[PDB]
Enzyme design. Structure first.
Site, short mmCIF file in Angstrom:
data_model
loop_
_atom_site.label_atom_id
_atom_site.label_comp_id
_atom_site.label_asym_id
_atom_site.label_seq_id
_atom_site.Cartn_x
_atom_site.Cartn_y
_atom_site.Cartn_z
CG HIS A 78 -2.05 -0.77 0.91
ND1 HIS A 78 -2.02 -2.15 1.71
CD2 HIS A 78 -3.22 -1.01 0.12
CE1 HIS A 78 -3.10 -2.82 1.22
NE2 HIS A 78 -3.73 -2.38 0.33
CG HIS A 82 -1.86 0.01 -4.42
ND1 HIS A 82 -2.31 -0.83 -5.11
CD2 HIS A 82 -2.52 0.61 -3.49
CE1 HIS A 82 -3.68 -0.82 -5.00
NE2 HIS A 82 -3.85 -0.26 -3.88
CG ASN A 239 -2.18 -5.46 -8.19
OD1 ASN A 239 -2.11 -4.69 -8.82
ND2 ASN A 239 -2.26 -5.37 -6.58
CG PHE A 290 -8.38 -12.17 -3.47
CD1 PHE A 290 -9.09 -11.69 -2.39
CD2 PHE A 290 -7.91 -11.18 -4.41
CE1 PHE A 290 -9.45 -10.65 -2.31
CE2 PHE A 290 -8.37 -9.88 -4.28
CZ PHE A 290 -9.06 -9.42 -3.38
C1 JN4 Z 1 -13.32 -12.38 4.49
C2 JN4 Z 1 -12.98 -11.36 3.41
N1 JN4 Z 1 -11.43 -11.01 2.97
C3 JN4 Z 1 -10.88 -9.58 2.75
O1 JN4 Z 1 -11.73 -8.87 2.50
N2 JN4 Z 1 -9.57 -9.55 2.54
C4 JN4 Z 1 -8.73 -10.54 2.70
C5 JN4 Z 1 -8.01 -10.83 1.38
C6 JN4 Z 1 -7.30 -9.72 0.43
C7 JN4 Z 1 -8.21 -8.47 0.73
S1 JN4 Z 1 -7.38 -7.17 -0.51
C8 JN4 Z 1 -6.43 -8.36 -1.40
N3 JN4 Z 1 -5.74 -8.13 -2.67
C9 JN4 Z 1 -6.06 -6.92 -3.53
O2 JN4 Z 1 -6.50 -5.72 -3.14
C10 JN4 Z 1 -5.01 -6.72 -4.78
C11 JN4 Z 1 -4.25 -7.56 -5.15
C12 JN4 Z 1 -4.74 -9.03 -5.85
C13 JN4 Z 1 -3.85 -10.20 -6.19
C14 JN4 Z 1 -2.50 -10.02 -5.82
C15 JN4 Z 1 -1.94 -8.84 -5.35
C16 JN4 Z 1 -2.78 -7.70 -4.76
C17 JN4 Z 1 -6.37 -9.70 -1.11
C18 JN4 Z 1 -5.66 -10.98 -1.46
O3 JN4 Z 1 -4.74 -10.69 -2.35
O4 JN4 Z 1 -5.62 -12.23 -0.85
C19 JN4 Z 1 -4.92 -13.22 -1.35
C20 JN4 Z 1 -3.46 -13.18 -0.89
C21 JN4 Z 1 -9.04 -8.19 1.78
ZN ZN Z 2 -5.84 0.41 -2.99
ZN ZN Z 3 -7.42 0.94 0.46
#
Ligand code: JN4
Ligand code: ZN
Ligand code: ZN
Length: 329
Positions: A78, A82, A239, A290
């Protein structure tokens, strides 16, 4: 009065600013860790925003450097890179054929400015972490969209620093409208609003109205702002739609950030957040999860909205998902 060689190489990389998959990490390097400033400046010039909004150029640069300096270089994901990525991705999404001539200059300004500030001063830990630690920020915002409220307050407050007020020539009417849209867009980046945003996006796809030139029809604030909210949310979650060489760099970064929160959660002794556990995580399973659950349903719906402008982006997402899956031990 002529570019240095480094400036020239930077300028050539920036010729891809209208393209999905800009080499943003290279731009960060070439610009001396000023990706947000150089990309913003480039986009403002490209969209003629300085002339349209009577923004003095030294004011714009001063504000941008100030904003970029309030992102944390010691935060793996972050950070200013980004922010720059989300700004440039929002810029590409705004130019999509299905949205040609839909949005006003002020709405465009709001989407881009909101993108630039949307994560400023991020400490690299989650809302839930801040709430559970009794952190000042969480108390300030009554545990409600803690970070997102903070990013907004900071982004706006920085306009008050010396020679930073890039909106100094807008009318009160322009400013009140701009401010409302920016606030609505950044609050919509809170992942806790994701299911709701997506619901409204689907609904809009179902009742989709095109108009005259084959272009989307948005005839009230609720619809216009929801599309902008979803657009920036897509950029924020873009991403896995990027070429794999970029995507993997982002995954490393977010896992570094998450594992670090996980460490601090073990240190303190709190129960460790989802996929934040360094010792027994599956980076690959988490990415597939995800994508299947969040990124793909979002981008698929977006693709439907602007069909078929986003086909290549969605295919790339699907290829990357297959790649990460294939790589599961
Ligand atoms: C129960 C609900 N869970 C959630 O709201 N979160 C858990 C995981 C996660 C985010 S935001 C985000 N990722 C992003 O905001 C952007 C991104 C996507 C893929 C690779 C790198 C960055 C992730 C993530 O990647 O999880 C997997 C490791 C927030
Ligand atoms: Zn952001
Ligand atoms: Zn944010």
């Amino acid at each position: 009065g002529v570019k240095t060689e480094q400036e020239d190489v930077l300028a050539k990389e920036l010729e891809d600013v209208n393209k999905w998959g800009l080499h943003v990490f290279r731009i960060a390097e070439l610009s001396g860790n000023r990706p947000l400033t150089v990309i913003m400046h480039t986009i403002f010039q490209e969209r003629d925003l300085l002339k349209t909004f009577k923004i003095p150029v030294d004011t714009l640069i001063t504000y941008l450097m100030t904003l970029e300096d309030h992102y944390h270089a010691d935060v793996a994901y972050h950070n200013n890179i980004h922010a720059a990525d989300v700004v440039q991705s929002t810029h590409v999404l705004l130019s999509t054929p299905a949205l040609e001539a839909v949005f006003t200059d002020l709405e465009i300004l709001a989407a881009i400015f909101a993108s630039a500030i949307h994560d400023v001063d991020h400490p690299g830990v989650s809302n839930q972490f801040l709430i559970n630690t009794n952190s000042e920020l969480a108390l300030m915002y009554n545990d409600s969209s803690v970070l997102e409220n903070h990013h907004l307050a900071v982004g706006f407050k920085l306009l008050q620093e010396e020679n930073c007020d890039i909106f100094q020539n807008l009318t009160k009417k322009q400013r009140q409208s701009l401010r409302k849209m920016v606030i609505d867009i950044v609050l919509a980046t809170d992942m806790s609003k994701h299911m709701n945003l997506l619901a409204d996006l689907k609904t809009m796809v179902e009742t989709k109205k095109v108009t005259s030139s084959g272009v989307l029809l948005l005839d009230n604030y609720s619809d216009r702002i929801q599309v902008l909210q979803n657009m920036v949310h897509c950029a924020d979650l873009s991403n896995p739609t990027k070429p794999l060489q970029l995507y993997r760099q982002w995954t490393d970064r977010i896992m570094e950030e998450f594992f670090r929160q996980g460490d601090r959660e073990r240190e303190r002794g709190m129960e460790i957040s989802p996929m934040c556990d360094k010792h027994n995580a599956s980076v690959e399973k988490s990415q597939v999860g995800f994508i299947d659950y969040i990124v793909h349903p979002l981008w698929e719906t977006w693709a439907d909205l602007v069909h078929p402008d986003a086909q290549d982006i969605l295919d790339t997402l699907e290829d990357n998902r297959e790649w990460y899956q294939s790589t599961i031990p």
